[PDB]
Design a binder for this molecule. Structure first.
Ligand SMILES: *[C@@H]1O[C@H](CO)[C@@H](O[C@@H]2O[C@H](CO)[C@@H](O)[C@H](O)[C@H]2NC(C)=O)[C@H](O)[C@H]1NC(C)=O
Ligand SMILES: *[C@@H]1O[C@H](CO)[C@@H](O[C@@H]2O[C@H](CO)[C@@H](O)[C@H](O)[C@H]2NC(C)=O)[C@H](O)[C@H]1NC(C)=O
Ligand SMILES: *[C@@H]1O[C@H](CO)[C@@H](O[C@@H]2O[C@H](CO)[C@@H](O)[C@H](O)[C@H]2NC(C)=O)[C@H](O)[C@H]1NC(C)=O
Ligand SMILES: *[C@@H]1O[C@H](CO)[C@@H](O[C@@H]2O[C@H](CO)[C@@H](O)[C@H](O)[C@H]2NC(C)=O)[C@H](O)[C@H]1NC(C)=O
Ligand SMILES: *[C@@H]1O[C@H](CO)[C@@H](O[C@@H]2O[C@H](CO)[C@@H](O)[C@H](O)[C@H]2NC(C)=O)[C@H](O)[C@H]1NC(C)=O
Ligand SMILES: CC(=O)N[C@@H]1[C@@H](O)[C@H](O)[C@@H](CO)O[C@H]1O
Ligand SMILES: CC(=O)N[C@@H]1[C@@H](O)[C@H](O)[C@@H](CO)O[C@H]1O
Ligand SMILES: CC(=O)N[C@@H]1[C@@H](O)[C@H](O)[C@@H](CO)O[C@H]1O
Ligand SMILES: CC(=O)N[C@@H]1[C@@H](O)[C@H](O)[C@@H](CO)O[C@H]1O
Ligand SMILES: *[C@@H]1O[C@H](CO)[C@@H](O)[C@H](O)[C@H]1NC(C)=O
Ligand SMILES: *[C@@H]1O[C@H](CO)[C@@H](O)[C@H](O)[C@H]1NC(C)=O
Ligand SMILES: *[C@@H]1O[C@H](CO)[C@@H](O)[C@H](O)[C@H]1NC(C)=O
Ligand SMILES: *[C@@H]1O[C@H](CO)[C@@H](O)[C@H](O)[C@H]1NC(C)=O
Ligand SMILES: *[C@@H]1O[C@H](CO)[C@@H](O)[C@H](O)[C@H]1NC(C)=O
Lengths: 416, 117, 49, 49, 146, 49
């Protein structure tokens, strides 16, 4: 509905809580190359050494991925020096974080929404999974510290020592951060908390309804399973030998021909590990590039109010809350969305003395009969004053200027 | 396990035999493969000590001043209360360090000095 | 060109890519940033600048 | 006799081929409604034609 | 097979280094040539500036940050009443030392007297949670009456 | 071995295109749907649109 003189301004807003899910680590793995290729066979090991360093060149590489997965999980979560705690009292201005703060009654202190996230996401051939350095309990303690720091102290715990603030004033700085005046919160605080608490409710039901929402995390687990299942099935392949079974080549033939039948199986099982390690090294780099993004959102989004458009959910970003997941993280981005717009007529500038006046913070609008100046992201019309406007030039230099009375608050005060 | 009367062997999802029926006693035995893993050596720098602690990855300590951990069996390092920062990582929340008369110790690590704000 | 080689087509053909750049551009010109944050809110282009 | 390699190679190239439509969708499809410009080109003197 | 292995390890490595050189180029563009509002992107703290130094095969940024380093507990209020209308701080927060009320900038304790130049108004005190009652000094009142 | 070469090259390439489509999607979010305060991200100068 564009014209050279029409503007739409929002008369109401909706606080919305969006979910964004990122993978952060793989299943760690080491494979004993010699046992994968030549398991329980010294006769096969004697030939595997003809290939030299390949056996170790692969172990080193898988060590590189496994040692990196604990760097990725450290970088995302260990962004805090102190385990910040909330008080036992919950006077957060009406904001009900109970569904994302810890439940102390469960043997791992995760939140209610973290249990929804853990519920929705799911050999002896040298293959060995290694445990992560951080257990899901210690991942959940780091996300609790990041969240209790966020609630009790705003962005300040990222900048230095945590400096407490009332949550209803933290949300006033947030609102001020999106270019909306602090009074728009304090006049609507019980609405804004019910919108927020309703939005946190909708997120549970969304997470409860389907596993498809965690699809990004499930796909990382699924690809590590497919590539281990494929690596294992490739033990059973002949690669042009008379059999796959290593003890049957070591009994159905004498040494001079068994050496060539074994070099068939070594050349195939070595091509099978070089393929698995290559697939995993590319896969692991795809997850490093996601763990570096989750670390970046944890810093810019949780530990601060991001101003980067659509980086921290759709809308104007207020704040976000980190929740763990198996091999991942979930951000709950709280965003202000302008909800219900009205059209107004508008003008770039106004005339009162042949000099032109301009809005300090906002825009000129008219309902049809009267001219006002309102903050740009919420309809709240001030009568036009020398307190709300600055001056330049004259009314001939500006295209599209209109005439209106400017109230000077000093005139009645001088006459009185 | 309850095999059907004509099934003689039982298979894992990987097409690996994981149970068998004893042909002289019609009852089923699990096969669990023989225990194996990485032997890992934990050391402070040789510019500090020539003490070493050994981790046998993902074994019960039976198959090997001995600690059962979710990473495996940890030997030559002494378990302790005091939760420190990590120094050498071990897995499943465990770390190790060389500390005071000085020996290698093993502990569940501290995440950071707690603070009710 | 027949040894298993195939080129699958893109899902968005270039007319539909060009309808999205039209929508993004028409949104940017007629409504500033407001179409990225929520429902779009018209503003005069010289007030947007 | 080489086993899974064929099936795996088809999968890997399928995984790439699908991803090229994720890339194109996430760049361009950042908009819910196909916004359009008015016929009256009164953009304060700026000529986007 | 030993070259196709080495060249694969190298192509993956060079992608890991390309991804880091694109971060280094971004940190230089955004916080040497600028001041970055992104939290912890250029050192811990609030970012002032950074200085690029070279290293063999790399770069080193000396990020200079403002860290808030001592603090005092205050009582605070979201707003204040005076003429029944509700007053809010333009820039800063209201605080009390325990006996008097001030307005101060949020990131550093430097108190100002509460005035109609340091505050703005909306509504009335019946609409606002947690509001308190204190004088707001109007610098015009003495300047008319003197 | 000539397919396991090609699919390795294409997997490494497709991750470089992925990393560029993620830059382009980020430029479209921060640069087009908004205004960027990030210096030299959206061309040399002070970014308007
Ligand atoms: C925060 O929300 C939770 C529910 O999500 C509230 O706890 C529930 O309170 C109702 C009564 O209003 C009880 O019927 C439920 O049994 C409670 N459920 C649980 C799981 O505790 C909690 O009281 C709310 N707090 C505030 C301040 O609103
Ligand atoms: C445009 O705004 C003005 C100012 O709010 C409206 O005039 C006021 O209307 C209220 C009732 O809503 C009366 O109590 C006031 O006495 C009026 N004040 C003045 C100074 O006139 C006006 O009605 C609005 N016009 C339109 C087109 O809605
Ligand atoms: C805004 O109103 C002023 C009057 O206050 C207009 O100024 C007059 O313009 C006419 C010619 O159009 C002259 O005959 C008068 O002598 C002018 N009077 C004054 C006091 O300047 C002004 O043109 C109007 N502008 C717009 C954009 O409507
Ligand atoms: C926008 O500017 C372009 C020039 O860059 C205009 O194109 C010219 O239009 C005039 C008629 O207005 C013709 O005489 C020229 O031959 C056109 N040149 C080209 C390269 O097309 C365009 O018409 C302008 N559009 C508007 C709406 O003003
Ligand atoms: C709170 O701050 C005020 C202002 O600094 C303090 O009041 C002043 O105290 C000095 C004596 O130390 C007097 O000479 C001034 O006249 C006082 N000013 C006013 C406006 O009364 C006050 O003492 C401080 N309170 C505490 C608890 O330290
Ligand atoms: C918020 C509002 O009322 N917007 C209206 C729009 O609905 C209408 O279609 C248009 C007609 O030009 O004028 C404007
Ligand atoms: C950096 C460092 O630790 N250097 C020490 C050196 O000072 C010492 O003399 C030497 C003893 O062999 O061991 C090494
Ligand atoms: C060296 C020593 O005394 N350690 C004990 C530990 O064995 C015990 O389990 C713990 C109980 O809290 O207290 C400490
Ligand atoms: C910075 C500072 O001194 N904060 C204190 C806090 O340590 C103390 O526990 C509390 C008691 O009410 O009062 C405040
Ligand atoms: C704003 O929206 C809420 C629902 O979120 C509604 O209750 C309220 O009446 C609306 N306020 C205005 C001013 O339209
Ligand atoms: C604004 O547009 C109207 C037509 O809708 C036109 O009559 C008027 O002259 C224009 N004014 C300016 C300053 O562009
Ligand atoms: C197998 O032989 C044993 C005697 O050694 C006998 O007790 C058992 O019943 C026999 N089982 C079957 C199935 O014939
Ligand atoms: C095997 O490990 C379990 C702990 O999971 C322990 O109870 C058991 O005693 C160990 N077995 C032996 C024979 O030590
Ligand atoms: C603030 O919380 C305390 C409880 O700690 C309560 O007594 C007080 O009345 C509350 N004040 C406001 C304005 O909510």
């Amino acid at each position: 509905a564009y014209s050279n003189n029409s503007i739409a301004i929002p008369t109401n807003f909706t606080i919305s809580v969006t979910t964004e899910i990122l993978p952060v680590s793989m299943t760690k793995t080491s494979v004993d190359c010699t046992m994968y290729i030549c398991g329980d066979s010294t006769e096969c090991s004697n030939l595997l050494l003809q290939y030299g360093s390949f056996c170790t060149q692969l172990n080193r590489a898988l060590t590189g991925i496994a040692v990196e997965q604990d760097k990725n999980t450290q970088e995302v979560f260990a962004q805090v020096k102190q385990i910040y705690k909330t008080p036992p009292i919950k006077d957060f201005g009406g904001f009900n974080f109970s569904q994302i703060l810890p439940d102390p009654s469960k043997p791992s202190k995760r939140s209610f929404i973290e249990d929804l996230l853990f519920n929705k996401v799911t050999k002896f051939n040298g293959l060995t999974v290694l445990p992560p350095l951080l257990t899901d309990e210690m991942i959940a303690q780091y996300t609790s510290a990041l969240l209790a720091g966020t609630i009790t102290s705003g962005w300040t715990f990222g900048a230095g020592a945590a400096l407490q603030i009332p949550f209803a004033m933290q949300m006033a700085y947030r609102f001020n951060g999106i270019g909306v005046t602090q009074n728009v919160l304090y006049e609507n605080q019980k609405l804004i908390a019910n919108q927020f608490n309703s939005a946190i409710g909708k997120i549970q039901d969304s997470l409860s309804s389907t596993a498809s929402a965690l699809g990004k995390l499930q796909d990382v687990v699924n690809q590590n399973a497919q590539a281990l299942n494929t690596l294992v099935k490739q033990l059973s392949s002949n690669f042009g030998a008379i059999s796959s079974v290593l003890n049957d080549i070591l009994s159905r033939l004498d040494p001079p021909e068994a050496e060539v039948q074994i070099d068939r199986l070594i050349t195939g099982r070595l091509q099978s590990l070089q393929t698995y390690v290559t697939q995993q090294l590319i896969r692991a780099a795809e997850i490093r590039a996601s763990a570096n993004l989750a670390a970046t959102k944890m810093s810019e989004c949780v530990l601060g109010q991001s101003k980067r458009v659509d980086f921290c959910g759709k809308g104007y970003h207020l704040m976000s809350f980190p929740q763990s997941a198996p091999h991942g993280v979930v951000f709950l981005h709280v965003t202000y969305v302008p909800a219900q717009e009205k059209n107004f007529t508008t003008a770039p500038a106004i005339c009162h003395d042949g000099k032109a006046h301009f809005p300090r913070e906002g825009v000129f609008v008219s309902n049809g009969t009267h001219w006002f100046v309102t903050q740009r992201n919420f309809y709240e019309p001030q009568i036009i004053t020398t307190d709300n406007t600055f001056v330049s030039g004259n009314c001939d230099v500006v295209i599209g200027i209109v005439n209106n009375t400017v109230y000077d608050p000093l005139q009645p005060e001088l006459d009185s | 396990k309850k095999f059907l009367p004509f099934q003689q062997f039982g298979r894992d999802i990987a097409d690996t035999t994981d149970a068998v029926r004893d042909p002289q006693t019609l009852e089923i035995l699990d096969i669990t493969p023989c225990s194996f893993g990485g032997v890992s050596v934990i050391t402070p720098g040789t510019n500090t000590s020539n003490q070493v602690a050994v981790l046998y990855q993902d074994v019960n300590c039976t198959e090997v001043n001995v600690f059962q951990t979710r990473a495996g069996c940890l030997i030559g390092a002494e378990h302790v209360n005091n939760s420190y920062e990590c120094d050498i990582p071990i897995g499943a929340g465990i770390c190790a360090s060389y500390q005071t008369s000085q020996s290698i110790i093993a502990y569940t690590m501290s995440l950071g000095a707690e603070n009710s704000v």
